[PDB]
Amino acid sequence: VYNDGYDDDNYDYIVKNGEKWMDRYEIDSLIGKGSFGQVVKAYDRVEQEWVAIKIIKNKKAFLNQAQIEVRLLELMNKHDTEMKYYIVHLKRHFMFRNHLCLVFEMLSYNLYDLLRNTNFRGVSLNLTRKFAQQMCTALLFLATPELSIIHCDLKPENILLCNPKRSAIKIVDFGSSCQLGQRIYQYIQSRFYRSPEVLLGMPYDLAIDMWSLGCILVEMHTGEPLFSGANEVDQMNKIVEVLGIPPAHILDQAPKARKFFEKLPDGTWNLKKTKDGKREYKPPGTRKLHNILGVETGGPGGRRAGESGHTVADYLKFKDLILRMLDYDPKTRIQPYYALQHSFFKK
Ligand SMILES: COc1ccc2c3ccnc(C)c3n(CCCC(N)=O)c2c1
């Protein structure tokens, strides 16, 4: 028996459609499940509107982390700027049957559902540009010194459309987020979108979100993840296929450098030796983003050949921005303010 019967064996609240909570919220259905807990669709009888309620797991570790998400959401929402409207709005929170419940504004489906709806053909470069500009503005908001918030889990699933037929988006799931000073985890971000500094076990800052954004934007247009690693070793090697060996000044400071690389006598770094002449990856830096995007061959897989807004000039700008987002060095990786000035966004 878990939580007097209200919970399942995974600390989740057993959702029952049609249940009414505190004579206010009418639970319609389950929207999604995550490590944090479940999000349900519910009607707020008081305010007479539809809301999304995130039911946090009934477990100390998850409750304590969700309390941080609340602190950060309330801190962002209080700030007055139009940029704050790229972050989902937390209306209120409450405890119910030993679950912390977060009430959010209702949104539409996420960018992964959007990709799946195109059968993973990818969205247009113009739509990608719209998402990129909004995301860069959102990251600029998080970078404001008073906030200095690191989302730490940017991915298609955590970027939602406000309206199913409109391009406006908002960022969700700040549970794993932290502030620049208060970093408390080492293994963070979803693997496909994890930055090299996190893979290498080095200290991280807001630049890790810019890395994830670069990965996301490419996936949005091509329809498949740029670095689809099955584990950390596979992830690092897939990054190396495209960007080459990380610079020595980074690896020389990386605690986990020898999980993926080895230092030669002449001081240079190379990938760890592979036994028995097994070939599993393209040589470092040979998987060109120029070809992944189809810059001069009509877009990803030639699917955008003879389409408006998919000129080579457009792709060369897109490629340059992505490569500046995928800089190995977090100190030189493009920052939101300057990314927004990139020619890719010129009117
Ligand atoms: C639909 O409106 C919404 C509105 C707000 C949120 C929200 C706020 C915080 N964290 C998460 C995971 C949130 N989700 C998850 C959806 C997952 C999905 N496939 O739609 C939301 C959804």
Short mmCIF file of C-alpha atoms in Angstrom, two decimals, residues 44 89 93 102 110 131 133 158 160 179 181 186 201 224 228 234 251 257 264 289 291 307:
data_model
loop_
_atom_site.label_atom_id
_atom_site.label_comp_id
_atom_site.label_asym_id
_atom_site.label_seq_id
_atom_site.Cartn_x
_atom_site.Cartn_y
_atom_site.Cartn_z
CA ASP A 44 -10.10 25.72 -12.78
CA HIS A 89 3.74 30.95 -16.38
CA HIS A 93 1.14 25.77 -6.25
CA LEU A 102 2.21 23.18 -9.80
CA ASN A 110 5.79 20.33 -28.05
CA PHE A 131 12.00 29.07 -33.09
CA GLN A 133 15.00 33.74 -32.49
CA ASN A 158 10.52 20.96 -23.30
CA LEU A 160 5.92 23.97 -26.42
CA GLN A 179 21.35 29.38 -10.89
CA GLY A 181 26.17 30.06 -8.27
CA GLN A 186 27.27 16.67 -12.36
CA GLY A 201 32.83 16.52 -15.89
CA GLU A 224 16.69 13.59 -36.53
CA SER A 228 22.25 10.51 -31.15
CA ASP A 234 29.02 7.06 -27.93
CA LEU A 251 41.04 18.32 -22.18
CA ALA A 257 39.06 13.39 -20.42
CA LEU A 264 50.13 11.28 -26.63
CA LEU A 289 27.49 19.84 -41.05
CA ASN A 291 26.37 17.89 -45.83
CA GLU A 307 11.55 25.62 -52.24
#
